[PDB]
mmCIF file of all heavy atoms in Angstrom:
data_model
loop_
_atom_site.group_PDB
_atom_site.id
_atom_site.type_symbol
_atom_site.label_atom_id
_atom_site.label_comp_id
_atom_site.label_asym_id
_atom_site.label_seq_id
_atom_site.Cartn_x
_atom_site.Cartn_y
_atom_site.Cartn_z
ATOM 1 N N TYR F 192 11.581 1.276 -11.798
ATOM 2 C CA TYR F 192 11.848 -0.137 -12.055
ATOM 3 C C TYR F 192 12.937 -0.707 -11.105
ATOM 4 O O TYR F 192 12.712 -1.784 -10.516
ATOM 5 C CB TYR F 192 12.374 -0.240 -13.552
ATOM 6 C CG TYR F 192 13.032 -1.584 -13.850
ATOM 7 C CD1 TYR F 192 12.317 -2.729 -13.858
ATOM 8 C CD2 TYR F 192 14.388 -1.574 -14.199
ATOM 9 C CE1 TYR F 192 12.920 -3.922 -14.155
ATOM 10 C CE2 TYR F 192 14.984 -2.765 -14.461
ATOM 11 C CZ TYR F 192 14.294 -3.965 -14.470
ATOM 12 O OH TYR F 192 14.857 -5.143 -14.754
ATOM 13 N N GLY F 193 14.098 -0.062 -11.015
ATOM 14 C CA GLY F 193 15.158 -0.522 -10.182
ATOM 15 C C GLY F 193 14.912 -0.467 -8.715
ATOM 16 O O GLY F 193 15.276 -1.349 -7.938
ATOM 17 N N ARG F 194 14.245 0.622 -8.255
ATOM 18 C CA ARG F 194 14.022 0.805 -6.783
ATOM 19 C C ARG F 194 13.102 -0.235 -6.227
ATOM 20 O O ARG F 194 13.497 -0.850 -5.191
ATOM 21 C CB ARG F 194 13.482 2.216 -6.568
ATOM 22 C CG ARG F 194 14.487 3.334 -6.794
ATOM 23 C CD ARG F 194 13.995 4.648 -6.318
ATOM 24 N NE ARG F 194 12.640 4.965 -6.783
ATOM 25 C CZ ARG F 194 12.385 5.784 -7.842
ATOM 26 N NH1 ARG F 194 13.335 6.491 -8.436
ATOM 27 N NH2 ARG F 194 11.103 5.954 -8.181
ATOM 28 N N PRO F 195 11.894 -0.505 -6.752
ATOM 29 C CA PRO F 195 11.052 -1.556 -6.107
ATOM 30 C C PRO F 195 11.676 -2.934 -6.164
ATOM 31 O O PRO F 195 11.510 -3.745 -5.219
ATOM 32 C CB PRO F 195 9.772 -1.428 -6.910
ATOM 33 C CG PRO F 195 9.818 -0.108 -7.542
ATOM 34 C CD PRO F 195 11.257 0.108 -7.875
ATOM 35 N N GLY F 196 12.385 -3.238 -7.301
ATOM 36 C CA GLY F 196 12.963 -4.555 -7.375
ATOM 37 C C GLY F 196 14.123 -4.730 -6.426
ATOM 38 O O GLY F 196 14.270 -5.782 -5.809
ATOM 39 N N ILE F 197 14.911 -3.698 -6.226
ATOM 40 C CA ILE F 197 16.005 -3.829 -5.289
ATOM 41 C C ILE F 197 15.483 -3.842 -3.851
ATOM 42 O O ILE F 197 16.114 -4.486 -2.975
ATOM 43 C CB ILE F 197 17.067 -2.744 -5.493
ATOM 44 C CG1 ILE F 197 18.410 -3.157 -4.904
ATOM 45 C CG2 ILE F 197 16.654 -1.440 -4.874
ATOM 46 C CD1 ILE F 197 18.996 -4.356 -5.662
ATOM 47 N N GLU F 198 14.342 -3.178 -3.629
ATOM 48 C CA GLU F 198 13.740 -3.261 -2.265
ATOM 49 C C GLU F 198 13.210 -4.673 -2.025
ATOM 50 O O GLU F 198 13.431 -5.196 -0.876
ATOM 51 C CB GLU F 198 12.602 -2.232 -2.160
ATOM 52 C CG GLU F 198 11.932 -2.220 -0.809
ATOM 53 C CD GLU F 198 12.876 -1.772 0.314
ATOM 54 O OE1 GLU F 198 13.829 -0.993 0.000
ATOM 55 O OE2 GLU F 198 12.636 -2.165 1.465
ATOM 56 N N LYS F 199 12.584 -5.301 -3.005
ATOM 57 C CA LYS F 199 12.132 -6.669 -2.866
ATOM 58 C C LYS F 199 13.333 -7.604 -2.601
ATOM 59 O O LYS F 199 13.293 -8.495 -1.776
ATOM 60 C CB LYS F 199 11.345 -7.135 -4.070
ATOM 61 C CG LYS F 199 10.715 -8.485 -3.891
ATOM 62 C CD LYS F 199 9.753 -8.539 -2.703
ATOM 63 C CE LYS F 199 9.333 -9.983 -2.387
ATOM 64 N NZ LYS F 199 8.747 -10.648 -3.545
ATOM 65 N N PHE F 200 14.452 -7.367 -3.328
ATOM 66 C CA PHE F 200 15.614 -8.140 -3.112
ATOM 67 C C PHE F 200 16.140 -7.947 -1.718
ATOM 68 O O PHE F 200 16.654 -8.896 -1.074
ATOM 69 C CB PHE F 200 16.748 -7.786 -4.126
ATOM 70 C CG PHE F 200 18.010 -8.377 -3.789
ATOM 71 C CD1 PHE F 200 18.299 -9.707 -4.098
ATOM 72 C CD2 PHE F 200 19.009 -7.620 -3.187
ATOM 73 C CE1 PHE F 200 19.499 -10.285 -3.780
ATOM 74 C CE2 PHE F 200 20.224 -8.215 -2.853
ATOM 75 C CZ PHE F 200 20.455 -9.533 -3.160
ATOM 76 N N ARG F 201 16.104 -6.701 -1.172
ATOM 77 C CA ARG F 201 16.572 -6.472 0.168
ATOM 78 C C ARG F 201 15.784 -7.243 1.175
ATOM 79 O O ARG F 201 16.304 -7.849 2.125
ATOM 80 C CB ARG F 201 16.590 -4.991 0.493
ATOM 81 C CG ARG F 201 16.893 -4.652 1.922
ATOM 82 C CD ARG F 201 17.010 -3.127 2.138
ATOM 83 N NE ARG F 201 18.364 -2.654 1.993
ATOM 84 C CZ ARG F 201 19.381 -2.933 2.805
ATOM 85 N NH1 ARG F 201 19.244 -3.821 3.794
ATOM 86 N NH2 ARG F 201 20.586 -2.489 2.484
ATOM 87 N N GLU F 202 14.424 -7.220 1.046
ATOM 88 C CA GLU F 202 13.585 -8.067 1.905
ATOM 89 C C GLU F 202 13.944 -9.485 1.857
ATOM 90 O O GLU F 202 14.066 -10.150 2.868
ATOM 91 C CB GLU F 202 12.104 -7.799 1.627
ATOM 92 C CG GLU F 202 11.675 -6.417 1.219
ATOM 93 C CD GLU F 202 10.206 -6.292 0.867
ATOM 94 O OE1 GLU F 202 9.604 -7.351 0.646
ATOM 95 O OE2 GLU F 202 9.724 -5.193 0.727
ATOM 96 N N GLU F 203 14.102 -10.009 0.647
ATOM 97 C CA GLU F 203 14.383 -11.430 0.485
ATOM 98 C C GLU F 203 15.753 -11.782 1.074
ATOM 99 O O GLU F 203 15.911 -12.834 1.735
ATOM 100 C CB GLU F 203 14.325 -11.849 -0.975
ATOM 101 C CG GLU F 203 12.969 -11.689 -1.622
ATOM 102 C CD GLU F 203 11.983 -12.482 -0.930
ATOM 103 O OE1 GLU F 203 11.991 -13.742 -1.026
ATOM 104 O OE2 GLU F 203 11.020 -11.898 -0.342
ATOM 105 N N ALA F 204 16.737 -10.942 0.876
ATOM 106 C CA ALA F 204 18.090 -11.164 1.412
ATOM 107 C C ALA F 204 18.096 -11.098 2.929
ATOM 108 O O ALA F 204 18.778 -11.895 3.609
ATOM 109 C CB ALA F 204 19.082 -10.130 0.883
ATOM 110 N N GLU F 205 17.336 -10.184 3.547
ATOM 111 C CA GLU F 205 17.172 -10.166 4.990
ATOM 112 C C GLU F 205 16.526 -11.418 5.457
ATOM 113 O O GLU F 205 16.887 -11.968 6.545
ATOM 114 C CB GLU F 205 16.405 -8.965 5.395
ATOM 115 C CG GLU F 205 17.117 -7.617 5.161
ATOM 116 C CD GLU F 205 16.307 -6.411 5.639
ATOM 117 O OE1 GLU F 205 15.132 -6.604 5.967
ATOM 118 O OE2 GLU F 205 16.860 -5.281 5.572
ATOM 119 N N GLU F 206 15.528 -11.925 4.724
ATOM 120 C CA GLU F 206 14.844 -13.166 5.124
ATOM 121 C C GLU F 206 15.870 -14.371 5.069
ATOM 122 O O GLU F 206 15.858 -15.224 5.942
ATOM 123 C CB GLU F 206 13.666 -13.450 4.178
ATOM 124 C CG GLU F 206 12.905 -14.742 4.523
ATOM 125 C CD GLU F 206 12.407 -15.427 3.285
ATOM 126 O OE1 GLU F 206 12.117 -14.754 2.282
ATOM 127 O OE2 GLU F 206 12.325 -16.661 3.302
ATOM 128 N N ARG F 207 16.714 -14.373 4.007
ATOM 129 C CA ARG F 207 17.614 -15.501 3.781
ATOM 130 C C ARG F 207 19.006 -15.285 4.427
ATOM 131 O O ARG F 207 19.939 -16.030 4.166
ATOM 132 C CB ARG F 207 17.823 -15.720 2.294
ATOM 133 C CG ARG F 207 16.626 -16.304 1.577
ATOM 134 C CD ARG F 207 16.699 -16.153 0.097
ATOM 135 N NE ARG F 207 15.593 -16.725 -0.597
ATOM 136 C CZ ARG F 207 14.390 -16.137 -0.707
ATOM 137 N NH1 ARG F 207 14.138 -14.983 -0.148
ATOM 138 N NH2 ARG F 207 13.426 -16.750 -1.387
ATOM 139 N N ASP F 208 19.128 -14.304 5.279
ATOM 140 C CA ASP F 208 20.353 -14.005 6.050
ATOM 141 C C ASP F 208 21.507 -13.702 5.108
ATOM 142 O O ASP F 208 22.590 -14.394 5.105
ATOM 143 C CB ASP F 208 20.662 -15.138 6.965
ATOM 144 C CG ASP F 208 19.635 -15.329 8.073
ATOM 145 O OD1 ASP F 208 18.885 -14.369 8.326
ATOM 146 O OD2 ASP F 208 19.584 -16.440 8.651
ATOM 147 N N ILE F 209 21.325 -12.747 4.210
ATOM 148 C CA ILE F 209 22.350 -12.227 3.322
ATOM 149 C C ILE F 209 22.600 -10.764 3.712
ATOM 150 O O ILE F 209 21.669 -9.945 3.588
ATOM 151 C CB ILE F 209 21.990 -12.393 1.844
ATOM 152 C CG1 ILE F 209 21.580 -13.799 1.509
ATOM 153 C CG2 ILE F 209 23.161 -11.928 0.931
ATOM 154 C CD1 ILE F 209 20.750 -13.918 0.227
ATOM 155 N N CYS F 210 23.800 -10.471 4.140
ATOM 156 C CA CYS F 210 24.111 -9.092 4.445
ATOM 157 C C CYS F 210 24.414 -8.300 3.231
ATOM 158 O O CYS F 210 25.225 -8.760 2.376
ATOM 159 C CB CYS F 210 25.325 -9.055 5.449
ATOM 160 S SG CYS F 210 25.023 -9.762 7.073
ATOM 161 N N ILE F 211 23.793 -7.128 3.107
ATOM 162 C CA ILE F 211 24.014 -6.237 1.961
ATOM 163 C C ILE F 211 24.970 -5.156 2.410
ATOM 164 O O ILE F 211 24.648 -4.377 3.288
ATOM 165 C CB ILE F 211 22.731 -5.658 1.445
ATOM 166 C CG1 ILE F 211 21.770 -6.790 1.038
ATOM 167 C CG2 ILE F 211 23.005 -4.785 0.228
ATOM 168 C CD1 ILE F 211 20.411 -6.324 0.598
#
Side-chain angles (χ1 to χ4, degrees):
Chain F
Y192 165 67
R194 291 190 309 256
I197 202 66
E198 182 65 26
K199 187 59 192 306
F200 171 78
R201 173 175 268 297
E202 321 176 350
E203 298 300 294
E205 293 179 353
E206 181 216 330
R207 290 165 178 77
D208 297 339
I209 308 159
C210 294
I211 303 175

